[PDB]
Ligand binder design. Structure first.
Ligand code: 6OZ
Ligand code: CL
Ligand code: NA
Length: 215
């Protein structure tokens, strides 16, 4: 049958313009509002994501949790030429949706999709994907994995001083221990950004944590 994710791709291909990442974002935002999917990203968190990318102008971005490719499109559209986005997706069929989504948008070149679990792929980045350090990390995958994958990104030495970690949904459904760690650690300087979830009528937020070097 035709899945929820395929319906989303299908709508984009009908109503967006190929090679125009912004129209892809509008179309997705428009569909999610029409079908009322509680998809965490909208213009609220989108503006903050855009701002974060603009301020720090990352050469290399790691995303955890590609899903349909909304976040990847939004971020990659602001990347400089020669900059890269690496997005990790554990679900093969989502990975394929994301691919097609990035390809429609004309961003297939900037973005590399890796299928597998974060804790398996992260330790391969330096050797297999010629990564030195990362400039930015967007966490949007399984919430119980935020804290262990942050610690794994430290252990592996993928963070340098000034590397930005940006984590969505830290309040809803919540990543309480992840927060406590980065806010408590001197290795991270932290800022909280608020986003009201108007479908659920409750406050959520993003956490931005800038790695300071090791303790
Ligand atoms: C240990 C993990 N590594 C990665 C890269 C993970 C991941 C999570 C996700 C979403 C789409 C959010 C997901 C996937 C399946 C069920 C629910 C939600 N995609 N990728 S989980
Ligand atoms: Cl998505
Ligand atoms: Na801190």
């Amino acid at each position: 049958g035709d899945t929820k994710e395929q319906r989303i791709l299908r709508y984009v291909q009908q109503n967006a313009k190929p090679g125009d990442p912004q129209s892809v974002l509008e179309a997705i935002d428009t569909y999610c509002t029409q079908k009322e999917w509680a998809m965490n990203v909208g213009d609220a968190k989108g503006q903050i994501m855009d701002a974060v990318i603009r301020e720090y102008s990352p050469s290399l971005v790691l995303e955890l949790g590609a899903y349909c490719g909304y976040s990847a499109v939004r971020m990659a559209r602001l990347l400089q030429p020669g900059a890269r986005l690496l997005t990790m997706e554990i679900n093969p069929d989502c990975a394929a949706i994301t691919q097609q989504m990035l390809n429609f948008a004309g961003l297939q070149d900037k973005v590399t999709i890796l299928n597998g679990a974060s804790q398996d792929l992260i330790p391969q980045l330096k050797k297999k994907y010629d990564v030195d350090t990362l400039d930015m990390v967007f966490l949007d995958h399984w919430k119980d994995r935020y804290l262990p994958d942050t610690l794994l990104l430290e252990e592996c030495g993928l963070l340098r001083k000034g590397t930005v970690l940006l984590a969505d949904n830290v309040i809803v459904p919540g990543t309480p221990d992840f927060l406590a760690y980065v806010r408590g650690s001197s290795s991270f300087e932290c800022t909280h950004y608020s986003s009201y979830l108007e479908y659920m009528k409750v406050v959520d937020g993003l956490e931005k944590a800038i790695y300071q070097g090791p303790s």
